[PDB]
Each structure stands twice: as C-alpha cells, then as structure tokens.
Design an enzyme around this catalytic site. Structure first.
Site, mmCIF file in Angstrom:
data_model
loop_
_atom_site.group_PDB
_atom_site.id
_atom_site.type_symbol
_atom_site.label_atom_id
_atom_site.label_comp_id
_atom_site.label_asym_id
_atom_site.label_seq_id
_atom_site.Cartn_x
_atom_site.Cartn_y
_atom_site.Cartn_z
ATOM 1 N N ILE A 71 0.662 -1.129 -0.088
ATOM 2 C CA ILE A 71 -0.011 0.037 0.070
ATOM 3 C C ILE A 71 0.864 1.321 0.045
ATOM 4 C CG2 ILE A 71 -1.615 1.468 1.476
ATOM 5 C CD1 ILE A 71 -3.001 -1.457 2.150
ATOM 6 N N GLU A 160 -2.296 -8.957 2.695
ATOM 7 C CA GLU A 160 -2.106 -10.344 3.124
ATOM 8 C C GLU A 160 -2.748 -11.435 2.664
ATOM 9 O OE1 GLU A 160 1.290 -10.414 3.817
ATOM 10 O OE2 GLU A 160 1.627 -8.850 5.061
ATOM 11 N N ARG A 163 -2.378 -12.376 -0.762
ATOM 12 C CA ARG A 163 -0.840 -13.307 -0.958
ATOM 13 C C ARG A 163 -1.020 -14.667 -0.476
ATOM 14 N NH1 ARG A 163 2.213 -8.471 1.941
ATOM 15 N NH2 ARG A 163 2.803 -7.245 0.263
HETATM 16 O O1 LIG Z 1 5.990 -8.370 2.723
HETATM 17 C C1 LIG Z 1 5.305 -6.978 2.527
HETATM 18 C C2 LIG Z 1 5.082 -6.213 3.773
HETATM 19 O O2 LIG Z 1 6.123 -5.780 4.285
HETATM 20 C C3 LIG Z 1 5.588 -5.316 5.658
HETATM 21 O O3 LIG Z 1 7.076 -4.907 6.367
HETATM 22 C C4 LIG Z 1 4.909 -4.097 5.443
HETATM 23 O O4 LIG Z 1 4.317 -3.383 6.676
HETATM 24 C C5 LIG Z 1 3.698 -4.452 4.522
HETATM 25 O O5 LIG Z 1 2.916 -3.178 4.389
HETATM 26 C C6 LIG Z 1 4.177 -5.139 3.492
HETATM 27 O O6 LIG Z 1 2.910 -5.629 2.672
#
Ligand SMILES: OC[C@H]1O[C@@H](O)[C@H](O)[C@@H](O)[C@@H]1O
Ligand SMILES: *[C@@H]1O[C@H](CO)[C@@H](O[C@@H]2O[C@H](CO)[C@@H](O)[C@H](O)[C@H]2NC(C)=O)[C@H](O)[C@H]1NC(C)=O
Length: 246
Positions: A71, A160, A163
């Site tokens: 984001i 998340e 994913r």
């Molecule tokens: O692995 C991806 C993620 O890393 C995190 O450290 C961030 O806070 C998230 O915004 C991101 O989606």
C-alpha cells in the site's frame, strides 16, 4: 480498479473481492503454478486503486503497487495521504493528483514502524471485517496515531489475504467478530519475501529450497518448509514477489 463494500459483506463477497484483487495484479509467468509478480511497471500502471466502502457507505481509495502488493497511500475525500517513504513519494507523482491537499503520514509503511506509531504489535490488534469497517472509518479523518492501527488492519485484510489463501480464510472466519491474527498468520506475513525467493530458487534446484523457511503452523507448531511439495506452496501462497525485488 477493484472494490469492496462492508455493507452486506459476508464470507462470500469478501472472497470475491480478494479474487478480484489477485486478478488485477499482472504477471507473464507462473512459478510452480503461482503467479509471479512483475519486476517493475513504469508510470501510472504500477498502481492499483482499491475502492473500499464502510458500512455507512463512505469511501476511501487505496493505491497499491502491483509489483509487491504494498500500500502506497489512499485518498479520503479531497485529501490524499502517503507513507513517508520514497516508493510512496514516487506514487504521489501518479495517483490522487486531484486531491485538494496531500499529507505525508509521519511513518513509512512497514510493519515495525506502523506498530511503533500505533503503540502495539499487531499480535494484539483484532482483525476481521468489522475491524476493516472501523479502519476505513478512521482513515476518513486525519489522525496519525489511530491511522497507524487502522493501516495495520487494512494491510492484513487486503494485501496479506491476496497473498495467502489461509489468511483470506482467517478473515472470512472473522466476518462478524474480530479476533487477533493467529501466529501462523503473523508467520506467513513475515515470510512472504523469503518464500517467494525460495520458490523461485527451487526452479533450477529440482523443487528443493536453497534455504529452508521456518513457519508456525495452524496448531501453533514451529515447522521447516524445504521444498515445493509443502502445502504452503501447493495450496496456500497465491502470489510471488519477484526475486529481482529481494
Ligand atoms: O512483505 C510485504 C509487507 O512488508 C511489511 O513490512 C509492510 O508493513 C507491509 O505493508 C508489506 O505488505
Ligand atoms: C519435502 O517436504 C516434505 C514436507 O512437506 C518432506 O517430507 C516430510 O518431512 C518429514 C519426513 O522426512 C516428516 O516430518 C513429514 O511428515 C514429511 N511429510 C510428508 C507428507 O512426506 C520431505 O522430506 C521433503 N523432501 C526434500 C527432498 O527435502
């Protein structure tokens, strides 16, 4: 663009939004049958707009980098907001340009920094559809401290979930009652980059990971993933961060 309305939301419409979200992310290859995100995209096409709608029907638009599912920032009425990070500053050159003013958040977007801003780890922040509805409502008016916790909720229930199929199912279980995320959920979030890389390295190593990934499983048990035969690879992960970005 993709959309999601908390009004009348149920495990089904949420599932549909997460499917739309994944399908909006472009790729040209699959690795072990999992879409591989692009190395880069130039200009405006790098960013997906998610239109989210709280229970009362008020809305924000969230900009998402289609290459890593991060984001960048969001638009709430006539004001845009972006994380305090170069990637977000670059996105501000392309999205929400017609906002009357632009606020940079006082934090970047990574979990550590948002948890500092929010005053608590995300182990202790309930997530679910009702919490998403709160998140949306909060982001509607600037409050950086409350925003940090709202963004923690919003990242987990949108990026998340796209994913990992398991995390999508966790949210669907929390459709009408929030609950803190399981430690498995936390583990997957934290391992997404590592898994994405090990799945890609297995392509020329006969499906064996060069380096094992340690996860926590549903039962709360610590486990090692060592090759593409694992349920995490075959059923769970839905999107791979390209190793060119790791
Ligand atoms: O692995 C991806 C993620 O890393 C995190 O450290 C961030 O806070 C998230 O915004 C991101 O989606
Ligand atoms: C590939 O991964 C699987 C696990 O997904 C490994 O098999 C498991 O590991 C041990 C036995 O060696 C047991 O604890 C598990 O119950 C096994 N599960 C299953 C379903 O077989 C396997 O050893 C790995 N293969 C390689 C080459 O690393």
């Amino acid at each position: 663009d993709v959309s999601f309305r908390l009004s009348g939301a149920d495990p089904s419409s949420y599932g549909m939004f997460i499917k739309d979200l994944r399908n909006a992310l472009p790729h040209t290859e699959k690795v072990y049958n999992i879409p591989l995100l692009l190395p880069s995209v130039s200009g405006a096409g790098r960013y997906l707009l998610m239109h989210l709608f709280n229970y009362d029907g008020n809305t924000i638009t969230v900009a998402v980098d289609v290459t890593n599912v991060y984001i960048m920032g969001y638009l709430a009425l006539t004001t845009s907001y972006f994380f305090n990070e170069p990637a977000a500053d670059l996105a501000s050159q392309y999205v929400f340009r017609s906002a009357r003013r632009k606020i940079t958040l006082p934090y970047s977007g990574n979990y550590e920094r948002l948890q500092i801003a929010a005053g608590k780890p995300r182990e202790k922040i309930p997530i679910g559809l009702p919490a998403l509805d709160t998140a949306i409502s909060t982001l509607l008016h600037y409050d950086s401290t409350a925003a940090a916790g709202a963004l923690l909720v919003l990242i987990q229930t949108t990026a998340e979930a796209a994913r990992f199929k398991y995390i999508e199912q966790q949210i669907q279980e929390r459709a009408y009652r929030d609950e803190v995320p399981s430690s498995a959920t936390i583990s997957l979030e934290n391992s997404w980059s590592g898994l994405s890389k090990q799945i890609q390295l297995a392509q020329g190593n006969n499906g064996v990971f060069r380096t094992p990934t340690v996860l926590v499983d549903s039962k709360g048990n610590r486990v090692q993933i060592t090759n593409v035969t694992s349920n995490v690879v075959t059923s769970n992960i839905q999107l791979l961060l390209n190793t060119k970005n790791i």
